[PDB]
Structure formats: structure tokens, C-alpha cells
């Protein structure tokens, strides 16, 4: 199947300072969050769904026992795409920079304040890639969001 | 789950002489391949992903005397859609022409050289269907190519 969890709340998503380390609250607009509802190959969207599910489960369901694993075992496939982390595992096997889901990067407009959907920072041989080695991908993202702003 | 393999390499994909029976290099443009990354019901896209995975595994990973199928057992769900072959099995049961993934057909522009995404040649009673029995599908693909040409 495919995921069906929808992110809660104008129309964007805001990560609190609890979900981030050494950072404050960060908000992403509707035009970027809306991509998380149709793309099947975004790590940031899957992690954002995981965080949203955790927040809602804490808010609504009770928590008294020594925690539990049944809830996440039952609803794991409604939040993420397992073949995404399978693809990352294969890229790790073949000796290619891969994604370990910790760090993400995005382009943010200096004046308008708009933002692109974050893409995860690739890691190679135990250390993060440096911007000089994926500058083409950043430029492609800039092109894409220039085109988006054009409409 | 959903497949996450992305085809290797402007932006098209070329099947070499080893990938084809009694044929030479065949290259498909960017616009046709881009449909392989979003559609869920194309057999040619799954075959392309299988061939690409085989090529990359041969190139990068080593090999030894005996063959191990653990890799394909692990990574099958990130390449193909099993419900597609299930659909073909169901159509086979109900006495309808189906796809056995052996032969494909596409449309070539005589002058421009742009092509469409190849579709499976249906087989009924152990024999391939004649073009007269799927002429409407061919005409619809031609209409679609005209529509995307006028855009």
C-alpha cells in the first residue's frame, strides 16, 4: 500500500523547538507541505509524518504503562515508505553517499521569506558531504522554485 | 510500499545490445522516462528498473563462483510493483489477453525521432495479438503524443 497519514496544522507545517536540536521554531508554507501528499520519495516528508504521529499519539492517547510497541508496529506503513530506507540501504551497500535521516538543507528567500521543501544532507564515509559536492542539486532546486514562483 | 529506484544515465535511458533480442542500441527520451517515476501501472518501467538494478549490481558489487539471490529477495520491492504482475495473472485467469513481459510496442515520429513509452504486446492463446485487435490503443497513444506536442 501507500501512506495515508495527513499532516495537521495557514496550510503549512511548523516544527517546534522540541523537534529540532540547537534551533528555534521553523515554519514551512503550504506550497512546500503540499508536495508531501503526492511524492513517494521524500525522506523529510516521511520523518515529518513520524513526528506528527508521535505528537498526536501523545496528545490524545494515554501513556501509563512501560510504553508499547504495538501501536507503531501496527501503523508504521501508514506513515512512511519502507522502500525509501531500502533504497538508502542499497546506496550504502554500493559505496555511494546516502541519507541517514539526521540533517536536511533548504533554500530560503532573503526578502520574500519563502522556502523550498528540505532535502536530506548526504553522508559519505562517516562524514557529511560538503556543499561543493552537491552544488548542482542546490542549483536545480533554485531553478525549480524560481519556476514555481513564476506562476 | 512503493518503488524508489531511479533510472541511471539527457535524462533519457538507453537499452544496449545485450538488453535486447536481435537489436542494437535503443534510446528513449527524457519525456518518456519521466513518466516511469510517477506512474504505478507500467510494465516497461518495472522492466527498465530491473535491468538497471542488474547493471549497477554487476558493475559495483563483486561476484564469486556461486550465485546468491539474497540481494534480489531484499531489493525486489524497491524496483517493481507486484500488483502489476498480479493484475496480469488475474487477466490471464479470466480469459483476457495479458502481458508476459516479453514484447513491447511504441510509436516513432518519422522525422522528429521522439517516441512514446513502450507498452506491452498482449498475448492470447499463446500467440501475440494482431495490430488490428489493439488499433484503438495505438490511436490513443498517437493522440496523446499530438497533445503533448502542441504543449
Amino acid at each position, epitope marked *: 500500500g501507500t501512506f495515508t497519514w495527513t499532516l495537521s496544522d495557514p496550510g503549512g507545517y511548523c516544527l517546534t523547538r522540541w523537534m529540532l536540536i540547537e534551533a528555534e521554531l521553523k515554519c514551512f508554507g503550504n506550497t512546500a507541505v503540499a508536495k508531501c501528499n503526492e511524492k513517494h520519495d521524500e525522506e523529510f516528508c516521511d520523518m515529518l509524518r513520524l513526528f506528527d504521529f508521535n505528537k498526536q499519539a501523545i496528545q490524545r492517547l494515554k501513556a501509563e504503562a512501560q510504553t508499547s510497541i504495538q501501536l507503531i508496529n501496527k501503523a508504521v506503513n501508514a506513515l512512511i515508505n519502507d522502500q525509501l530506507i531500502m533504497k538508502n540501504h542499497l546506496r550504502d551497500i554500493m559505496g555511494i553517499p546516502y541519507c541517514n535521516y539526521s540533517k536536511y538543507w533548504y533554500l530560503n528567500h532573503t526578502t520574500t521569506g519563502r522556502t523550498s521543501l528540505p532535502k536530506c544532507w548526504l553522508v559519505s564515509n562517516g562524514s557529511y558531504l560538503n556543499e561543493t559536492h*552537491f552544488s548542482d542539486d542546490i542549483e536545480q532546486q533554485a531553478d525549480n522554485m524560481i519556476t514555481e514562483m513564476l506562476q | 510500499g512503493t518503488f524508489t529506484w531511479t533510472l541511471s544515465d539527457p535524462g533519457g535511458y538507453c537499452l544496449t545490445r545485450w538488453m535486447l533480442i536481435e537489436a542494437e542500441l535503443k534510446c528513449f527520451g527524457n519525456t518518456a522516462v519521466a513518466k516511469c517515476n510517477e506512474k504505478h501501472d507500467e510494465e516497461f518501467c518495472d522492466m527498465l528498473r530491473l535491468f538497471d538494478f542488474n547493471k549497477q549490481a554487476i558493475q559495483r558489487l563483486k561476484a564469486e563462483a556461486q550465485t546468491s539471490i539474497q540481494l534480489i529477495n531484499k531489493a525486489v520491492n524497491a524496483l517493481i510493483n507486484d500488483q502489476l504482475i498480479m493484475k496480469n495473472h488475474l487477466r490471464d485467469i479470466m480469459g483476457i489477453p495479458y502481458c508476459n513481459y516479453s514484447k513491447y510496442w511504441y510509436l516513432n515520429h518519422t522525422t522528429t525521432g521522439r517516441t512514446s513509452l513502450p507498452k506491452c504486446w498482449l498475448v492470447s492463446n499463446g500467440s501475440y495479438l494482431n495490430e488490428t485487435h489493439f488499433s484503438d490503443d495505438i490511436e490513443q497513444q498517437a493522440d496523446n503524443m499530438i497533445t503533448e506536442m502542441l504543449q
Partner: antibody
Amino acid sequence: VQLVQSGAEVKKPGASVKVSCKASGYTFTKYGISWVRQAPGQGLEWMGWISAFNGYTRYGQRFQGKVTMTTDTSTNTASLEVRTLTSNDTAVYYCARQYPDQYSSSGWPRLFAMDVWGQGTTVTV
Amino acid sequence: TTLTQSPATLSVSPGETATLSCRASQNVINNLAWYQQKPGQAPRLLIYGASTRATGIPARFSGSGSGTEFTLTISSMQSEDFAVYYCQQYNDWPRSFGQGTRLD
């Protein structure tokens, strides 16, 4: 599009050599510069690669600490500095344009070779 | 990785083909480069990739091979082709160069 590597230098061993090449004919920031040393008689040998976009440096295994690379976007130049000289450091030094290797999440690595070279600078001790 | 060039000398008359071989220590998937250096001049890029030809290179130069063994062939040898030839891998750091062969 060419690169011009300063001029020939000779100096007493133990001092520092400061060779440079100015890149013209292309967007300097896009491509990095790799340094190759050829001793008299022997074959080519790699020194290190410095990116002109931000100054990221990848040094050779045996040239770490002994040599340094710098860039200057305002002057469109790349520079190599050798600290301690010895009788085996006499050679010819070449700076070669090289695009940074590119990686992406949705794609495969694209690695590059040295496209254009500059005439070498001879260093003797 | 380290890569070596077996022949190291190809004394041959003009007109006939010449074959040059390169072997790598580990796997280098189609990430080779053949450079030509005439005496007294800086090396120039002949072949990048396994078999792709650089711009401005005559068609008489061809590259082939992948993995560990690679080959370079010159069909119609001429007088200006008597130069040194170098083999480089760019699959991983640090970059490596061949010991070179002098086609005389």
C-alpha cells in the same frame, strides 16, 4: 580558457615556493583546480584539489602539511605554497581545471577528470 | 588504488595500429582517463570516461574496457603521435596516475 602558471623559479633549498596560475575564459567559481607534480624523468603525481566555490581542499596522502592551496575569486587565481624544499622537490608543477564531483539523492555520482591544463612551472633547488 | 601500464615501450613505424593497456588495483567502473604528453609540453586530455573522446581529438584514438582492464588503440599512427601516454583513475581519492609508456 587556458591557465597561465606564473614563471619559472629557482631558489636555495629550505625556503618556500609560491606558484600561482590565473584562470581566464570561464566562470572561475564553477570549477576547482588540481595540482600535479612531475619530477624530471618520472611520471605525473597528484598533489591535491581545491574547490574555487568555497575553498574546500582534498590533499594528497603524503603532501598534507607540507603544501597548501589557496584561491582568490577577486583575482581569479589559484595558488600553491610549498613550505620546506628538498633535493627531490625539483619538478614541474601543473594546475589543471577539474569540475567538482557531484552527488544527488535522486541520481548517481558524476565524477570528472582534468579538462584543461596550464603550461608547467619549473622549480629547481 | 594503484594502476600500472604493462607494455612501457611501443617502438613502431607510422601507419599501423598501436595498443596500450592499463590495469587497476581495484574496481574502477568506466572512470578512466587517457592523457597524451608530447615532450616539452603539458599533458592534454585524450579520453575521459572509459571510451568517450575529448573535444578536438581525432577519431584515430579509441578507448575501451571497464572494471579493471582497459585498452587504448590508435588506428592510423602518425608522426605527432609519438608521445608519452598516461592512465588516470578518478573513481576515488586520492587520484592515481600510471607509470607511463613511451610510444616510440
